[PDB]
Amino acid sequence: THSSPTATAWEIGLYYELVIPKHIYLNNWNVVNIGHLVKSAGQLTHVTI
């Protein structure tokens, strides 16, 4: 905004985004799906839910 050899001035426009939490979860586990093997009319099959 101003520039002299002994004096300056500046302006900055900052925008912020604040997330507001509804709930926070701390003690968490990932799932892993191993399923089961089945043998049927000669064919080996992997089964999963």
């Binding site: 089961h36 089945v38 049927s40 089964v47």
Partner: peptide, 17 residues
Amino acid sequence: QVLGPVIDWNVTQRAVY
């Protein structure tokens, strides 16, 4: 149309000695 197999993840049921 015959009834097929049942699974239940129980290891103890499938033990072989």
